[PDB]
């Protein structure tokens with residue numbers, strides 16, 4: 001499969017900046033969701049899940065075709081809970097009917113990160129909606145009950161190397177697990193709707209205890225009320241991941257720089273960009289615009 005990026009006919013930077021401003025203003029207004037964490041974490045989780053279905057060997061899945069709108073992908077067990085992010089964005093899609101699905105789903109994640117004080121993520125437009133029969137089968141997103149070898153191997157299908165996997169994983173500063181969605185329960189940190197290197201400082205500084213939860217799954221619990229999944233705890237069990245973890249715990253700016261580069265790559269996998277295509281857009285925040 002080749003998936004060539006096609007700009008939505010007639011639109012420039014200012015059109016997309018309006019869609020960003022619409023999403024960001026609604027993040028600000030609907031601040032009560034999930035005990036006042038707000039919708040920003042479930043929106044960066046949605047953008048990673050529509051992207052993480054990619055397979056580098058046959059170019060199927062990935063963010064291009066906006067296939068999450070289809071039933072098979074929408075009802076994937078691993079996607080439980082993302083329907084709230086979908087419903088958040090649906091009024092915005094009626095307001096800007098010209099944006100493709102894959103571009104709206106992916107721009108939600110970018111807007112969420114930047115509005116939660118994160119790095120600027122360069123974004124590119126041009127995803128095109130593809131038919132229901134291009135919807136990837138369920139089962140391509142990662143399990144949480146596994147080790148660092150599973151993780152390295154999983155991420156190689158999206159050709160992410162070790163540095164990109166540890167940078168990406170730090171999105172755990174945002175949000176929390178929810179027992180009814182995943183069988184896991186609790187946050188990774190205390191400031192869970194501000195983007196910081198907190199995930200790394202908690203993994204290195206807390207006294208973690210392995211326990212089973214009410215769903216009979218294991219997770220690492222700390223006295224502070226935080227949690228870590230088996231796949232998260234893996235990052236300090238592996239010698240190669242652990243040195244990168246320490247690097248981000250001592251330098252949030254290196255973490256912001258690497259997260260930025262890796263998250264754009266995750267959102268662009270499986271998409272060819274012609275070089276007549278626009279350069280990647282760096283969107284201004286509400287705050288930079290005085291809004």
Ligand code: HEM
Pocket residue numbers: 041042044045048081142143144151168169171172174175176177178179180181182183184231263
């Ligand atoms: C091996 C990798 C990963 C696994 C096993 C994994 C697993 C999970 C699980 C089980 C949840 C909780 C779902 C719920 O109950 O609501 C979760 C949440 C989340 N994940 Fe990951 N994750 C992985 C990678 C990533 C990556 C690469 C990102 C982002 C770049 C990410 C971002 C998030 C965010 C922000 C949440 C919180 C969502 C919320 O608050 O509702 N995850 N993840």
